[PDB]
Design a protein around this ligand. Structure first.
Ligand SMILES: *[C@@H]1O[C@H](CO)[C@@H](O)[C@H](O)[C@H]1NC(C)=O
Lengths: 50, 50
């Protein structure tokens, strides 16, 4: 989404697209953190819990 | 009576010396370990992203 056309004026148009994906996570010893298929690091052990 | 070793003895047999093959132990040897090959790269995407 972009703002409608108004002459000699700046306009701001916000777009929010919810996205959900199934990614393959990987982890290595000591398994204290894991990465995702998108290359994002997650600094939490995959087995962390209560 | 005289001993058996008092007379000169000549070997009537055609000696054949047989030297068995000595046991050999093979130790591990690698020109470049898998860790060295990984370290050969100037940059590592895993460490840089982390
Ligand atoms: C080995 O063989 C040679 C002949 O090739 C013989 O003269 C010798 O006595 C043998 N034994 C030893 C311990 O050298």
């Amino acid at each position: 989404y972009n703002p409608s056309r108004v002459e000699a004026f700046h306009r701001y148009g916000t777009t929010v697209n919810c996205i959900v994906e199934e990614v393959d996570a990987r982890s290595v010893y000591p398994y204290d953190e894991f990465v995702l298929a998108t290359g994002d690091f997650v600094y939490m052990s995959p087995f962390y819990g209560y | 009576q005289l001993s058996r070793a008092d007379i000169t003895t000549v070997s009537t047999f055609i000696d054949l010396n047989i030297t068995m093959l000595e046991d050999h132990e093979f130790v591990p040897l690698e020109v470049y370990t898998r860790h060295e090959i990984k370290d050969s790269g100037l940059l590592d995407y895993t460490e840089v992203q982390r």
